Amino acid sequence: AADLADRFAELERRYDARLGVYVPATGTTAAIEYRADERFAFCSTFAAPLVAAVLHQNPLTHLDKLITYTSDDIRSISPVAQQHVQTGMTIGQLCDAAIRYSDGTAANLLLADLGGPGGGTAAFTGYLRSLGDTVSRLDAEEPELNRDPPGDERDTTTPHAIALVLQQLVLGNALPPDKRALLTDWMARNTTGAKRIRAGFPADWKVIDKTGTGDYGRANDIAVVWSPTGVPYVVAVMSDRAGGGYDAEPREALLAEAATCVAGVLA
Ligand SMILES: C[C@H]1[C@@H](SC2CN(c3nccs3)C2)[C@H](C(=O)O)N2C(=O)[C@H]([C@@H](C)O)[C@@H]12
Structure with a gap:
């Protein structure tokens, strides 16, 4: 806050980045929005609504179905799937890995x-x-969905759009309670997000999230956070550093700082 838009712009200059932020309005807080309707690549953030889609589409026990795959299926960063290729993974294991490890396979x-x-x-x-x-x-x-040129609309969402989607999935009634809980727990146990939105909120706030990272310095995080008194907020932060070209380093710190600015307003 000096103001919030000024703070976000300062972060863009610091990281030579384009930053997008959306927090939906609640009972007593206005929506927070910065480039919120600009398109940014999903990267692995799509895996959260993907798991919701698969959950919604099938009986719950479809989670127990074994899926087999092999060498030519491993085409992207896949921390879990690379380890289980010899045995296969259940749909449930695949959901777990897709969310908690951004497993591309x-x-x-x-x-x-x-x-x-x-x-x-x-x-x-x-x-x-x-x-x-x-x-x-x-x-x-x-891995192709990470590689669209800056400005290209393929494989994109916006901070505004993905926040409203995540809000329906975790807080709303998009999924029945049992499937909603599966999704929420997987995001709660995410392993890839400690230096992003989680880094910006005090430890007494609960954070669940799904990250994404890609080329042109792309770094995203979508989260649902709960205050110490149980008031939830949805936080979408997206960024790229197109000015550095394809090999521009993703910079998590930008997301941590953006989230710290958001947390200051929501506290
Ligand atoms: C690039 C990953 C991760 S970030 C990448 C994983 N990293 C590290 N693993 C161990 C230490 S750093 C850096 C990144 C992410 O979510 O953070 N993400 C995606 O999005 C893909 C895609 C395969 O789903 C991947």
Whole structure:
């Protein structure tokens, strides 16, 4: 706050970055928005609504179905799937890995499970449309979805759009309570987000999140946070550093600082 928009702009200059932030309005707080309707690549953030789509589409015990895969299926960072290729992974294990480790092979297999044209990308986009998101689009799977040139609309969402999607999934009634809890718990146990939105909120706030990182210095985090008294907020922070070209380093610190600024306003 000096003001908030000024603080975000200062961060953009510091990190030679484009920063997008959205926090939906609540009973007593106005929406926080900065470049909130600009498009940014999903990166692995899409895996959160992907898991919601797969959960919604199937009986709960579909989680117990074993999926087999092999060498040519490992095409992207896949910390868990690389370890289990010899035995296979259940849908539940794939959901766990896709969310908690940003496992790209897991995401790819879940896309294939959802099925339909574009290896599942069309049905994934259709799931978002069913939640009233007319903005986001997924066009490729991993790793290609991380590589669209700056400005290209393929594989993008916006801080505004993805926040409203996440709000419905975790806080709203997009999913029945049992599936909602599975999704929430996986994000609660995320391993990839300690230096992002989590870094910006006091330890007595609960944080669940799904990160994303890609080329052109892309670094995102979408989260639901709860105050010490149980008041929830949805926080979407997205960034890229197109000025550094394809190999621009993603800079988590930017997201941590942006989240700290948001937390200051929400406290
Ligand atoms: C690039 C990963 C991660 S960030 C990357 C994983 N990293 C580290 N692992 C151990 C130490 S740092 C850096 C990054 C992420 O979510 O943070 N993300 C995606 O988005 C892909 C894609 C395969 O789903 C991946």
